[PDB]
Design a protein around this ligand. Sequence first.
Ligand SMILES: *[C@@H]1O[C@H](CO)[C@@H](O[C@@H]2O[C@H](CO)[C@@H](O)[C@H](O)[C@H]2NC(C)=O)[C@H](O)[C@H]1NC(C)=O
Lengths: 49, 50
Amino acid sequence: KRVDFCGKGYHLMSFPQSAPHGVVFLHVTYVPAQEKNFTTAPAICHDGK
Amino acid sequence: EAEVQIDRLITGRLQSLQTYVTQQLIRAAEIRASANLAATKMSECVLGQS
Ligand SMILES: *[C@@H]1O[C@H](CO)[C@@H](O[C@@H]2O[C@H](CO)[C@@H](O)[C@H](O)[C@H]2NC(C)=O)[C@H](O)[C@H]1NC(C)=O
């Protein structure tokens, strides 16, 4: 859950690969797309509640 | 006779310059870790909730 620790976006999973004197991580993340506009409210009022 | 006296200065000044350059490497390795912590705090406290 650490932001940016395992790639950009919401981390899903990672896979390691070996390199000559190092390691390559393949990070799979979720990136939200195609946002729409809406009107919001904090609470609803119904029956005086 | 001035070669022998110039070499005594050359040796000293080289020693002093190289001491300066070692202590800067050791001080930069410490500034680097602080900046690496600042970069993690910017990710985890400013662009998120930790
Ligand atoms: C949600 O609505 C806002 C405001 O209506 C949109 O903001 C527009 O942004 C563009 C930038 O290219 C401005 O030129 C417009 O003046 C803004 N207002 C408009 C178009 O009414 C925003 O784009 C909307 N978001 C989505 C995802 O559609």
